[PDB]
Nucleic acid binder design. Sequence first.
RNA 1: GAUUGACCCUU
RNA 2: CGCCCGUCGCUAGUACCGAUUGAAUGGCUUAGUGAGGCCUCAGGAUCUGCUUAGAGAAGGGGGCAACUCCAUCUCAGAGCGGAGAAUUUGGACAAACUUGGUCAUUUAGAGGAACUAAAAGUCGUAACAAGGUUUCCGUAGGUGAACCUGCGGAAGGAUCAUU
RNA 3: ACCCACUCGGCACCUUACGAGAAAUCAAAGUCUUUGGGUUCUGGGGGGAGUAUGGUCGCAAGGCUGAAACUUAAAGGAAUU
RNA 4: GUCGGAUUUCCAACGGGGCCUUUCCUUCUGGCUAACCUUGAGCUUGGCGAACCAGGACUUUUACUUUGAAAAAAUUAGAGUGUUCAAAGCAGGCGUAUUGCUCGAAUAUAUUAGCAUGGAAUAAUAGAAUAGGAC
RNA 5: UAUCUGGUUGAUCCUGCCAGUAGUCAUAUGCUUGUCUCAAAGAUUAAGCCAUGCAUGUCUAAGUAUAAGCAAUUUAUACAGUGAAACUGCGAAUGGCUCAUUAAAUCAGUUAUCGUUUAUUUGAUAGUUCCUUUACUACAUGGUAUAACUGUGGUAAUUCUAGAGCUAAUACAUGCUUAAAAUCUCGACCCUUUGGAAGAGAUGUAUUUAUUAGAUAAAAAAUCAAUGUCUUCGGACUCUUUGAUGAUUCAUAAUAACUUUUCGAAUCGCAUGGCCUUGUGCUGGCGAUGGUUCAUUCAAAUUUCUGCCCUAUCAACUUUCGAUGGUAGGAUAGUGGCCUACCAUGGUUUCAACGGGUAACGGGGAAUAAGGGUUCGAUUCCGGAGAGGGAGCCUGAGAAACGGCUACC
RNA 6: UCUUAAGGUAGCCAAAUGCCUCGUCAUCUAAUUAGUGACGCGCAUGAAUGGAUUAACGAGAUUCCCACUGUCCCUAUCUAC
Lengths: 187, 142, 124, 258
Amino acid sequence: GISRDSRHKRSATGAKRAQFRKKRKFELGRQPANTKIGAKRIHSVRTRGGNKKYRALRIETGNFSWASEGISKKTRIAGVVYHPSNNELVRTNTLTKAAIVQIDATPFRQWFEAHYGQTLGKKSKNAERKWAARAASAKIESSVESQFSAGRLYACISSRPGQSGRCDGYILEGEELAFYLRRLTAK
Amino acid sequence: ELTVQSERAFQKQPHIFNNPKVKTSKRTKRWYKNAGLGFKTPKTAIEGSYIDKKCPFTGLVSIRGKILTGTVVSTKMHRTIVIRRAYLHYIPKYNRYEKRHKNVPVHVSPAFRVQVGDIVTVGQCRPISKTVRFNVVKVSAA
Amino acid sequence: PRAPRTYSKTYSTPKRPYESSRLDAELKLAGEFGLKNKKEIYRISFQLSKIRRAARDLLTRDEKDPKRLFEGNALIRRLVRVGVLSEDKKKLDYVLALKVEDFLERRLQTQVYKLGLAKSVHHA
Amino acid sequence: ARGPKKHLKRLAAPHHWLLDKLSGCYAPRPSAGPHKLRESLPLIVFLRNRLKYALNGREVKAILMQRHVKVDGKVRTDTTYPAGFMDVITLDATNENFRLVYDVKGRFAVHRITDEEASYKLGKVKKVQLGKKGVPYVVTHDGRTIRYPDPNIKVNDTVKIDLASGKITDFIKFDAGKLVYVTGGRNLGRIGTIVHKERHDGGFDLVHIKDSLDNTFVTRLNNVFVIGEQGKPYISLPKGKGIKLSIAEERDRRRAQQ
RNA sequence: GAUUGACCCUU
RNA sequence: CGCCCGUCGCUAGUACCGAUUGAAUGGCUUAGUGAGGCCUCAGGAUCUGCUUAGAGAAGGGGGCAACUCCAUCUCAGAGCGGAGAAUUUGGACAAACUUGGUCAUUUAGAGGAACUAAAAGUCGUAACAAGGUUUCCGUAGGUGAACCUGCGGAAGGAUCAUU
RNA sequence: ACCCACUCGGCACCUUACGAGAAAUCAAAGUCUUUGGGUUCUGGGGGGAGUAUGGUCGCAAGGCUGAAACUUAAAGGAAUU
RNA sequence: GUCGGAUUUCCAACGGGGCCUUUCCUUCUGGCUAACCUUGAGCUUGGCGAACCAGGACUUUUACUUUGAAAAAAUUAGAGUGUUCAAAGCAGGCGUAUUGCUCGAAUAUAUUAGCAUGGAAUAAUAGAAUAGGAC
RNA sequence: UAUCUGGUUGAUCCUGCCAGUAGUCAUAUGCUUGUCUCAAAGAUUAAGCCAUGCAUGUCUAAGUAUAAGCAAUUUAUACAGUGAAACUGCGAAUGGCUCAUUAAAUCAGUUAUCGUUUAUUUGAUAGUUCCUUUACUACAUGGUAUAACUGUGGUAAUUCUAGAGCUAAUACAUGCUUAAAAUCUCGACCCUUUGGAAGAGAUGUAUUUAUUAGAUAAAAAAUCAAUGUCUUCGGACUCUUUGAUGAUUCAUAAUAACUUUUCGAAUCGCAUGGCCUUGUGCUGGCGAUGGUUCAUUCAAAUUUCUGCCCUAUCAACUUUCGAUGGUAGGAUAGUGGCCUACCAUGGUUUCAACGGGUAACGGGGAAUAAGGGUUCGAUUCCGGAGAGGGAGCCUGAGAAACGGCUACC
RNA sequence: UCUUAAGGUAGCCAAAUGCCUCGUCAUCUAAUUAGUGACGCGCAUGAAUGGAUUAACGAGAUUCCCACUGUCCCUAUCUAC
């Protein structure tokens, strides 16, 4: 029953607009997804001209991208930690866009070991040569190493789960890291 | 706006990714654009630190349609101001005019510094808020 | 539904209902031209006023105006087609001063009496 | 409201159909097709009024579904198929081909041509893009898409297409000193031999257009349409050659060749 | 400088 | 012998006020209820398919008689996709109602008070002449009624005038 | 200090009309059907009525704003005989 | 000169394109190579731009005022039109009459508004003054 | 047709109204009413209430016909039907009607979508794939069952209907045949530093998360962490273009590359031309549409700029959390306080906001003037709204649809 | 005119003052000698023997409404003494 017009709102001067039309099909709204973690459940809704929209509810796994390393993998989420919109969303551990979640980083660790060969936290000659050639660029900074030792990476979801049914995101690196981590440690 | 990260969210231009690998001059990237229609992009918009997703140059809005001008009457609103558009409305029966005006609210990018009484020109963009539909492109008064 | 069909009046009543001179003139005109009503006189006066207004609005425009020349040529062409204006004088005085008497004396009913086919206006 | 209209009232159709406002409460609504609703001439009116070969709608439908008509070389068995401008209507019966072009005064006139001319048609491109599979293409005024055009064809240029295959037989660029055919506004139906155009950064470019008699006007770029080079045109033009001779001249030549 | 208050019918 | 004013008396009409927590209609509502549809964790049918061990049965088969009875149909126990019609966890849209807060809105009302009208009512004679106390204005008081009086003002005065 | 030319700014006066006006009369009430220097306020037949009602100011008396219903063919302006 | 479209000494006038009168149609780099310093015995190899294009710049701002989509449809009078004339619709008209052909249904935009364009009269806070004015 | 006349007085000049006069595609009414054409016609009060009858259903040669429907052809036992019905499709969202609401709201002209959807329509055909991967299966081909056909369910009843013997899908999932260049990779070796023969996965978009080719206008100087075109170590690097508009993160594709996998024809009609190591095999045309999909349009939604009658006996209006903009999110088809968390009294206003009234739908548009125009516009055309009022929704490209459903008076 | 000097003015009223009287009309109720508002020839209202009105106040008198309840329908049970 949610509507999406402006005729129900007060005019820019503050005048109460009169009732002009009934609520219209082309300006409707729908209930929030409030998608959660675990037991992936996607519901399909038929919209204007077909155009199936995948409303996510209790998603489980998502596709996260390390932009610097130019990699992307599927990975399960460990829960949200900070939300610019609302802290109640953080408490409810719900999923929305631009939400900061934790990931277990296991596929990323496996990619790092398979592609660079540097140990984290604690063989053919040709493959060793290739790894040594790709090496000498495994020293980005200290927080990434600390997070990978911890086994939980901080990443923000860039997708719209209630629009596409996918909780796709990217891992924080650089100034967004240096901002969100100081925000979390600031208490 | 002394601090560009005074908000809860991290203010960053979409899809402008700065590689941390290099350590040289200009370690961070800024995205601007030519607004078009002959309006020059200020060096402040070129080299600033603000984000302002609604900026004509450093934002994602495209300026198209009407191009208006007027003197600002209120600047007490964040990133948006109201200009006064004075005009004369013709009345055939009496064969003369009457002073009329219309306060239109427009969005002011942090590239421009404006104050009450300044004449600014604005260009139409997509609806930015409930009332704002124009973005300032030049300040023409001191 | 269907497009409307336009209909226009063809006559006009005098502004003063009882003018002795006008009543005498109209009765004499209708008696000498064999008319059944003053509505015929009203119709002919209506078209006379229409064409006089047309001529005045034509003279409104500047001399050597294309619209003025065309519209005056059309009006004079129709006037000479009905046969009232001179075939060798383009002086337009008759155009500005056509008369109800001219229009009725050009009308058909009196044409028979003029050419001598009935010898009486009412018999015609 | 609530969905696209299917009916068309009389007095709401474009005036250049030369319809009669009486004798019927409705007008034949053009269907979606190659041209716009307003600047199109449906086969029903073309066969009932321009040609009189069909007296009413039942006969019009009889012709089209009896398959005596092909539009642009294709039958197009639709009673109100939108037949717009520059398109060729071929009738194997009577072996007669028409090119739908505006007359001097902007009404789609009957323009009989031969098989050689009816083979092809001209069309101004609408835009040049890079469609799917990375294939460059041009979308023209006819709703036609031409695949793999040469890099030099740009906007507002026109293409002459053989109408049988996808080959680009010829094209005419857009530049000063080029003959055009103005389609829209007061000047629907005039021949151009243009001189220059005003840019006016922001939209609505205009071109200055002087006919043979040194009569010069202005017409929007979206309203201009080039149909050949200077001198010889790429198609044949109907009677009067579309020069807009004033009404005094009209009566002059009528009373001359009465 | 007193007391003189009033007078039903048409252009 | 003109004209003319007001009270009072008769007749009708008009609007106004009016106790009646007057009443009847549509808008937003501090608060409190709340039908139906729509978004959401969970209980119940059925046909489908893979398999090694338990029954009744349309030719017990390698020595035709102690051992495998043939996927041939029947029966309970092992693993899964199509109905989420009985509630609802959380909700949102939101029909339908109170004591109280308005719309020159509409409308009833005992009674009160004023105005308006026509040929012939009573009482006076206030004004029009210096109208017999010049008239009139503001204000205040008084009085059957016009009106009278005080105070200030005006001339539209009955003086355009003093030596 | 008066007496005489005489500028300037005031209160006013004295004879047709240049003009205005319905006239009385008016050097403005003129320069307005040969109609526009700028600007404010007010009126739209007589009454009902400066009433009712709602505001608002007032101690009050009352002041300011302020109608309709209804009634009416005149009411008025200059004294021409 | 063609039995009133025929215009040379046309010396009776003009917004606008050029020159002198202190009175110029925006940088600086280029492509056709910019109103041309460049005679091939009779439509040219390099000095300068805006009358198309490139990028920074200004009609600091108007009001005002001629030129084109602008009131999408019938009207305004019609080259013309016999519905019994006419109101009306757009019809209609002519063959060596067995053939057949064809003109035409356009012209005013119904305030204000937004567009592009020429103009400068009619009214300026704006410049540069306790110079953080111009090459 | 730029016009006036009677009424105040004994008479006179005047402001001043009353009355007269003439129009009304304004209405009603009275009397009368013979012909020719088009003719408005329950608008005004009650967008009051409605008996009845009708007003949206519809198929071809080309989805299904095996109906105790029908008349049946023959030098073919090698496939001619019509067709009262009912399932899949499409429409029923167009028409037509009425002005109730609605006074910056509709609407008119002009803008914009570089801020979005769009069934049919047109131009356009989709080879990259066995995601337990040199076999877990049918490509001269699939799997599931309610629709038809025969008795029964209630009284006065309705467009109410159930469990049986069956049936192909264009009703619903899975699947496949192309040995046409090439990158990223796993890896027997000489024991590095111009290196090279072997076997296999991705290369269409639906999520848009990383760089780009996505540049664009002039002459000299070399030692790099990580070698390209190059081949007379003194033989050069010029070829790094796949783009119009004023403007873009706009318009392809690659090293990353997800999913509950809509899809990449398990479709119907019409005359058989050619190949044979001779089959109920192989090759070749004319017609219909779901479906990656890309572009005016029929379209819709938002959307600039200016303009709307009366009223100040309406001067301040907009509120715990929308009235203000900003940041992030959700929802939308999409922008946007359309809504959610934090941050101000921000926004409008005598140039009249806000409030009230309208016997107010708006515009095109009748009645007069070369300019005084004042009214009216329910009504034939366009844009709105509504289907007794409010609210909610399914299907559908399109509906808040009311001759579609779900709830009172 | 007469008694006896004047004849009840402004106001107010079946009033805490009106016998007739449970006055008449309206309203309030299903029904009202009650209440309130009107009307007054008022047995016998009335002007510092003060008239009329009046905000606030009242263990003053009276009417109605909401809430509340064992007053009541219609009673029952429990505790202490």
